[PDB]
Design a protein around this ligand. Sequence first.
Ligand SMILES: COc1ccc(OC)c2c1sc1nncn12
Lengths: 196, 198
Amino acid sequence: NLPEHWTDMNHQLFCMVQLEPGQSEYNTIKDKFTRTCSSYAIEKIERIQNAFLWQSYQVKKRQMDIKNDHKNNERLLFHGTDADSVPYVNQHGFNRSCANAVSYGKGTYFAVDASYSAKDTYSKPDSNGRKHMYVVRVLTGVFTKGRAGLVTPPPKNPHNPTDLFDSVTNNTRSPKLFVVFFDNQAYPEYLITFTA
Amino acid sequence: NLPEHWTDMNHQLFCMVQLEPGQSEYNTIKDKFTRTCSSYAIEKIERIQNAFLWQSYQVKKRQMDIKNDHKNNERLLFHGTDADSVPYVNQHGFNRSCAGKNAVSYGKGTYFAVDASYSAKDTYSKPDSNGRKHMYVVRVLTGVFTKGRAGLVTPPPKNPHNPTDLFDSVTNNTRSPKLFVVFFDNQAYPEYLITFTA
Ligand SMILES: COc1ccc(OC)c2c1sc1nncn12
């Protein structure tokens, strides 16, 4: 059940597809980034077509939509990383056992604003000054305020300890960071290669 | 597609089902256990019916069967744990971020034993206040494996010049495996909980 906007993969299960400048998909992803990163230079945008990562993610989404009894569990977020992590993320997605600060818990971190992910500490410039940021589908679901040392989100009710929040944030009224603690709660959808 | 021999869960997503001694389902688990744990005695064997854990595990199995082009990817292994961990594992499965440092570490992941005897040690299946010890019987996607190393947070690559093409699991010994370590969520399904005593 692979998304309609994907391009044919000749019966392959993994392809990085460079987007054409000026077309709608490219323009939509460009604007999300330039909203807060209009001072940077975009070299290219790639659609991540990972069928295995996509089905594992869609299964979790269907599970969360049922458990939460609504379908507002998904957000579009940013993740800056180093050149050496890119092949891993394209192929295997986000892994909390890899991850800088972890002051809201030991999970994978996603930014509301591209400009947060554009910091050199996250989108580390390679030899050439090239920086890498993903546009990520993440199942934030029902979230609470994080804190240092969490290995999973907290329970909603301390009297049902196993019924958990889906994600954690820096601030529930006005979130700028989300962290998720489970594989396949995030799908890396686009890779933006850019420079200062 | 939940399996057809499961109890009807009446639209519910989770159920522990107590097995009856003399059923093949109970007896096979008891033989697997007593093969190395003759000195212990089983209080009960519960079938774990977790719809969500089953779905995610089954999509990972189908993915690994496609990728490895063979279907010898799944082993039935043991996992001893403490009583405080049992409600979390029943609902959420095995979380490498919660895993103990093993006495012989072949990587930072969730450990599964070939022999019940290994999982039966008090270090893993810690007796609760009532002398009850807890051991899961677990479907594990061991897939293609290699000898692990203490430093691993992911399985190593099959080929150093292709760092993203990973072994599926690691073992203590590839010729005679007694334990397996997995590094991903939904790579292990807790199928039975054995409650036992001395
Ligand atoms: C405190 O926030 C983070 C901690 C760690 C992060 O990745 C190592 C991270 C953020 S925000 C962000 N955007 N891309 C990556 N990350």
